DNA sequence: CGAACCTGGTCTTGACTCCATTGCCGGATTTGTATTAGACTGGCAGGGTTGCCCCGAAGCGGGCG
């Protein structure tokens, strides 16, 4: 998700199935980190995904 | 036949000129330092891009005392 004048973010898929959410080129932290960081609960994560 | 001469220099003496060369001296400018009393208290800031390779370091699975 490359913008004009901003920071980057990538949602890869590893050799395993853990979707890596490397933000501003600081690799780790699968998607639930960003989702519950956004305020999403495990119920809504189960519902949409 | 000798003799003046006339003129190359070779050199000196004496007066004159003229400009460096310090030397103060008075002032001009140049450069350095000190001091300003209301109150003020943790940066802006700019980008992330290749490919390939080597190798050294961090961290994690996996057994072991």
UniProtKB/TrEMBL annotation:
<comment type="similarity">
    <text>Belongs to the RNA polymerase beta chain family.</text>
</comment>
<comment type="function">
    <text>DNA-dependent RNA polymerase catalyzes the transcription of DNA into RNA using the four ribonucleoside triphosphates as substrates.</text>
</comment>
<protein>
    <recommendedName>
        <fullName>DNA-directed RNA polymerase subunit beta</fullName>
    </recommendedName>
</protein>
<comment type="subunit">
    <text>The RNAP catalytic core consists of 2 alpha, 1 beta, 1 beta' and 1 omega subunit. When a sigma factor is associated with the core the holoenzyme is formed, which can initiate transcription.</text>
</comment>
